[PDB]
């Protein structure tokens, strides 16, 4: 380092390497559909199940 040359003297370099990037590894993941339940609110995914039979039982009772 050029400031470290100003109090002591360097010899020839034995190794010349650079700055690498350390980061922690996420170690992968699995595919999932609970992840797909998330961009909508999770109560609405159960709210889909509600009015389907609201149409269905009304269609069942007026078969007359």
């Amino acid at each position: 380092t050029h400031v470290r040359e100003k109090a002591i003297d360097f010899s020839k370099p034995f190794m010349t390497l650079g700055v690498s990037i350390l980061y922690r590894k996420p170690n992968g993941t699995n595919p999932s559909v609970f992840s797909f339940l998330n961009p909508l609110s999770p109560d609405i995914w159960m709210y889909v199940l509600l009015a389907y039979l609201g149409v269905s039982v009304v269609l069942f009772v007026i078969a007359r």
């Binding site: 909508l40 609110s41 109560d43 609405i44 709210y47 009015a51 009304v58």
Partner: peptide, 22 residues
């Protein structure tokens, strides 16, 4: 509730298709 949940606008046709009396 995030965007919706209104079952109130939807219930108009439920009372509409009951008409069987002449």
């Amino acid at each position: 509730q995030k965007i919706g949940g209104i079952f109130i606008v939807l219930a108009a046709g439920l009372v509409l298709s009951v008409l069987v009396a002449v």
